[PDB]
Subunit: 311 residues, 6 copies
């Protein structure tokens, strides 16, 4: 398998319309979770991809495996854990801030949080080209964090999305220290991050300076996401910038995962950072126009159409 | 207040279409929870009713309070608890058994489960006519169980719906020991139960025999629910039976609570057991026709219309 | 035109779900009104049919005109009245009586109620085979009543559905005197009625007795609707009875209209009362399975299929 | 209570989709009416607020009462009137003008319009800090106008939103005389208006000039709404302007109400006009992003978040 | 692989409500086609199953492969055919016959119709335990019929559902002759059929006589479907009857495929005809309660629950 | 009749949500087809308009006729053809290009494609003011192409929208040869086209140059559509340009037809090209805001409101 990702796949319940949850009557279900979204993007760009994860022995767990399998993700290492349930979350859209979303989690002690070093086979990780994970997975439990540590130790190369969700951590200091410690211990082939997380991690928001400090920690490629201002990629003292496109925002949740999975799978295939980046911007632009995270993540050929035709 | 109920109110996510949850795309939100449903039925039959409960300091908790307030439930004693979240559940409908439902809970460690003896004021409880709770509240935590024991000690009179949900107990033996202990300790003015629960508690299913044993336990009035077969009420040496009505079933969830709160509230105001039973059946028939436990619970006058007009 | 009808066409808002209107969030719009439903049945049985009516100079009036035109009703004599609004109503379904509906009208002083003798042209009316109206049109205003009196004076033959809606009259006594007054004055080729109306009008229940007394009033054919118990047609010494079919009921509103239009138009084509009745029953049966009143009114040939195939 | 409002609360039926009503199949029900929307804004900014009004003895009236109660509006003086019906209206969205709405009323002779001096108690009114109403209530009937005259005579302070709806008046000249008559007679602590109304009332457009002429009429604070161009507040020699924010507009209906209730209640709490205005703009901005008028009216603290975070 | 099926998978567009298609506004998409439904039932009973088929190089073709893969069907032999499109059909529900459905096909010259002997690998068919197909596949083109002939020639054992759809054949004679010719050429381990098809094929409707005549053609097991009267299974001069259950019918489409695939996969596993049959009745009962064909097809363990609990 | 259009009207199945069709679950039905959309716009601007077309003897064909009849299109010459089916298509929205759509046709060999010279009566066509068709009708079959050639020979005046859909042609060379041949043969009073089509026909995109070449081909008035850039109209030595308006785009399908039928119908009645152009833009702006090609096409008076009020 080309890419192994470790994480907790989740069921998302997206409010049918904007406003505080107490006034929403209908909820539309999607399959999501940061690494799962990433994996969808990897397969859409024609690399094989496996999600190492746990789900509950329940309908929602089975929904995750079947969906993933439908979309071409290798599910052989998604373990069913009878001891706990499949984690979920709700999205409150556009309140109190228009065009922004807020997540309400029901994932404490979930099957997914029970991801552990025992799930990480040494031969299997070593046969892959790259291992990916995120700061969500580092947050969910000590054993999931240790699973990432073990996979990263065994990996040929690594990618990490910082993805700091302060609600998942006892403190920002803990987030900071946990993520910095991974960056300091391992070379990171592609780091995906943004000004918010980098302020926490490095006390830096400036893109060029971010690259300089992350490069000093052993990061080869920096993908620096700027939201509605676009994104920047850096490799070997070369910068590429691509501006965002103006579209109506339904739900931005998962836009960075579409970008990151697209960027990383194209980069792995030998595409330059300019092309990988423009495709990542294309992927993000499509996903935010709708409620789900990953259904509109384009294939490489569809993303090329987007870039050649969309103005 | 006339009636006090102790319980965990919950947000219900009702599948828009029947079938396994992994194939359901849309969920319709309702406010529910057994004793909440019970309280709705009480106020529909013109007694004041307070729910003693905890909710989270979240949208779903505000939902519960606002909905209760809208429906005329006294919400003075629904406490917002910042330490945890408002419990929720999903309804899977019509699979694997047509016209029945299954519940998937997200309530472990919830705010509602934090209901405790300190939430039970002696002067407030003594001030009421009757105190109601259920085996669900006895199951959700040790402190919620102790809160009911304390409310029952203080009460002028007591109703209990056995409501055994096997998923909420460590074993059926624990359910039996916990519920039997309450029955041996207290007089119960109205006990609401059914064959399934009575099999567990008494190792009998025969209605006459159930009444004989329950009566030895200090049960004055037995409401013995038979689902699509109707229900029987017993008092002293009177036995009243009424058949269920044939209606299309959307979701029978909450049917028992609609019957129980209707029955108890009418019984308390002097109505005989036949009248109370028939209004109970009428309430249950209406609610099972829709998604939603309690919106269709009829007022006294609407249940009379039903009984006079429907065949 | 073969058939002229006088009445008030209306916009119907059905509850998407059963229950008290205060809990209904969605309403589905349909085009209806008793004589409009009747006209749809007439054209489906391959006669030409004109509705004489008023609508407001508003969207809902244009809705009525266009929907009628789409369905092949001659709309030449539906007049736009800029002085008032198109009448509308809401349907509450299945509460407090399952499988039954209640109507909440917003029609007082509507354009439809402004139907008047001046809308009734002598030459136009004399050139049709039959003029139909209902006790609804007799109720809505003094001028609509007078419009029916005038059309009935000029007509070659008449039908009348008694259609007593107690909400539209100041008393049942007022309805009785107004409707008997029509019956006494004119010959009625087809009278459509039922036990409820007949009890008010003639203080009899028994169908055979009803026909004897109606015959004294100048009634040639009696269509006597019995709801879930079927219907009976009488002509001379022929009595025909047909049982209702068991179907899941969504909304019975307009069933009688589909029956009455179907019956009358077949009867006008020389079909005997047995055939006309069976077709009327087929028409009623189909329309009660769904929210709208007239979309499922069968053509002659479709009603024949239903009768041959459905048991 | 801190604030008393007089008006007609209404049931709103919004088109699920944009377009001429004749092509709309689905309508989504919301609870609204100008002074009701205003009351929701008042309570969200943590003052107590009572609506004095009538509703019909019908489902939609119960809907109004329960929704108001759910939202913490004091409903003690919303009277059930068995002699008429609860008024309602429809919203046509985005046709013929995108991002704008048109209202089609069914409210003539409604229970709400039967609001009258006899509903206005001297002691109750004198015991509040402020009485609010609008030019809508002045229009709906002679007695509702008189009810406002009486409440304004007894009040410690008053607010008035001019809210001229040309459909509710026999002429613009009638509106002008009726509303000037109020302004001439009473001191007005907060006047809410806009160029359209001010042009009718004072034959001026320029905001500075408007305030000079309004000040002669006894107006202390002027809130001057400019739609997509923002709003201006005036008090003494303070002028405050705030631009509108760019958001996708679903339905602007009730924006001014959310603004006016927010502004007035903050102003009554000793917030300066700058702060009150910015909060009113935040409230308007949120509610126009969705179908209903008042579900997204922010609390004080949520409006602070919006202001600090949204650009 | 245990079971190979040959057929044309199809996209189904199910009317959201009953009535003639011209009045239906919404269509709900499902993945279906007789053999695909069969394959879902086979995998739900824990045998491996492969669908040999073609789909278009289009979204609907990809929808078929992904859905099938999600549900555990081996899709390695579903070929994408760029020369044509994925076939679809619409279902008109409950008109002109309540509780019955009518299919409108758009499948002429489809990718699926291009199934040919060239798609049938000799080694692959010979490694399987059983090959299944239906009279639909025999109808769709000469080359699909020849594909079935070749697979049946190579198979260890065979199953056939007669599934005569007269719309797909030039005449009933052609259907009859084509199906009889297969029955005469091959032993058939399980034949699934009913009175309608057997009247065409044998001029027999009587179950016991049907068995006798089909046994004389080389059929080992006869599964004889009786709709709302249940179904009968015959093997070695033993009959098993199981009555149907009373449930509300949403859409019966695919009920026989659920039954047949369940029956055949359990029979293959050594279950007796009594058990295989009761499970087939369970599968059919669940699917007809909803719009899709195969989402509610139960697993073996869920079907056991159904049979033990549903009365 | 003033205007005759020749075409294939179609049933549209519009995805309820954006994205790849395999992820869409719900489809909303509309009546569409380019020349049908054109005719709607003609009658909205107060000319009589007949559509010459074939539909199937099926629900979808009856749909088309009834809808056209409802909207005031003369349907005397929409012929029901028992030999084939009514053509349909699906709209995939927002993927892979945001705010654009893609069409998937089910129309090969349709009834509409059977439009032929025999459907074109010489006296009927000569009797009209103008004849319209499009490159779609020229593509669907040889006989439909010949039907347009014949109608154009007979016509007093002609409009043509080039409407090149590459999927409907064997090659772009065939489109170019077929359309160029019509242009060289006939005077064209209004030609509607755009850069994409003009690139194919003339190997130019520059608007001024396009007009120069088209004018040599006997085009009197050129309508040159620029999508989100607006449109230009040319006549003699006048050039009128109007920008597009910024609105949220749901589906731009049919926008060109709304503009074309509006423009042509207004031009025919004496309006100058600026007025006709501006009303065209107004019509197109409205339709792109919803699913559905033609429901929001404005009347003359509504487009004036739009132009006077919208910014
Ligand atoms: N408002 C917007 N308008 C246009 N494009 C946007 C907008 N917001 C986000 N994007 C796109 O989203 C890309 C990545 O967004 P970003 O906020 O960095 O990821 P994120 O916060 O990681 N999302 P998530 O996956 O929930 O963690 C940007 O580079 C844009 O291409
Ligand atoms: N299939 C049915 N048909 C008609 N009435 C029914 C049916 N099922 C239940 N009821 C009615 O509901 C009443 C309560 O039955 P029951 O199903 O035992 O309660 P329950 O569902 O256990 N309630 P709950 O604990 O509140 O989820 C019965 O006495 C009937 O009046
Ligand atoms: N519950 C039902 N079940 C089956 N068929 C029914 C049912 N109700 C009505 N019908 C059929 O409808 C026919 C007409 O019924 P009826 O109740 O007299 O109409 P109605 O009251 O005049 N309806 P309306 O058109 O709204 O005035 C009956 O004779 C039956 O064929
Ligand atoms: N199109 C818009 N875009 C952004 N903000 C808007 C828009 N329209 C209104 N607003 C906001 O709403 C505020 C109030 O607008 P306004 O149009 O004066 O209300 P209104 O006409 O009184 N509405 P109503 O409550 O139905 O009477 C404005 O000052 C803006 O903050
Ligand atoms: N009205 C009904 N009520 C209850 N069960 C039914 C009803 N109709 C069908 N069934 C069930 O469906 C089973 C098989 O139905 P049947 O009509 O033989 O298959 P079919 O016509 O092949 N369906 P299809 O898959 O579209 O080809 C029966 O044995 C019943 O278990
Ligand atoms: O299981 C629970 O706790 C519930 O609250 C579910 C339902 O609301 C109720 O119990 C049905 O009786
Ligand atoms: O492509 C076609 O033939 C259509 O009819 C699609 C649209 O209705 C129309 O062409 C859009 O211009």
């Amino acid at each position: 398998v080309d890419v192994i990702a470790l994480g907790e796949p989740l069921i998302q319940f997206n409010s049918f319309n904007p406003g505080p949850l107490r006034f929403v009557n209908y909820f539309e279900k999607h399959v999501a979770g940061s690494e799962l979204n990433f994996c969808i993007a990897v397969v859409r760009n024609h690399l094989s991809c496996s999600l190492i994860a746990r789900v509950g022995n329940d309908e929602f767990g089975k929904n995750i495996i079947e969906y993933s399998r439908a979309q071409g993700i290798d599910t052989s290492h998604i373990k069913v854990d009878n001891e706990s349930f499949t984690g979920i979350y709700f999205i409150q859209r556009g309140y109190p801030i228009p065009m922004k979303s807020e997540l309400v989690y029901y994932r404490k002690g979930s099957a997914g949080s029970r991801l552990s070093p025992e799930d990480i086979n040494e031969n299997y990780v070593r046969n892959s080209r790259l291992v990916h994970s995120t700061g969500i997975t580092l947050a969910i439990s000590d054993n999931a964090k240790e699973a990432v540590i073990k996979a990263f130790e065994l990996a040929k190369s690594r990618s990490l999305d910082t993805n700091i969700r302060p609600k998942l951590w006892s403190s920002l200091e803990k987030a900071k220290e946990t993520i910095l410690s991974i960056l300091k211990k391992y070379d990171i082939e592609v780091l995906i991050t943004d000004p918010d997380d980098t302020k926490i991690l490095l006390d830096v928001t400036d893109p060029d300076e971010a690259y300089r400090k992350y490069k000093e920690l052993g990061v080869k490629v920096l993908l620096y996401k700027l939201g509605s201002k676009g994104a920047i990629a850096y490799k070997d003292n070369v910068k590429a910038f691509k501006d965002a496109y103006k579209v109506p925002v339904e739900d931005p949740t998962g836009a960075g995962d579409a970008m990151a999975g697209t960027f990383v799978s194209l980069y792995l295939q030998g595409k330059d950072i300019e092309y990988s980046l423009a495709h990542g911007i294309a992927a993000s632009t499509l996903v935010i126009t709708v409620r789900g995270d990953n259904e509109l993540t384009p294939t490489l050929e569809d993303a090329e159409r987007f870039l050649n035709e969309f103005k």
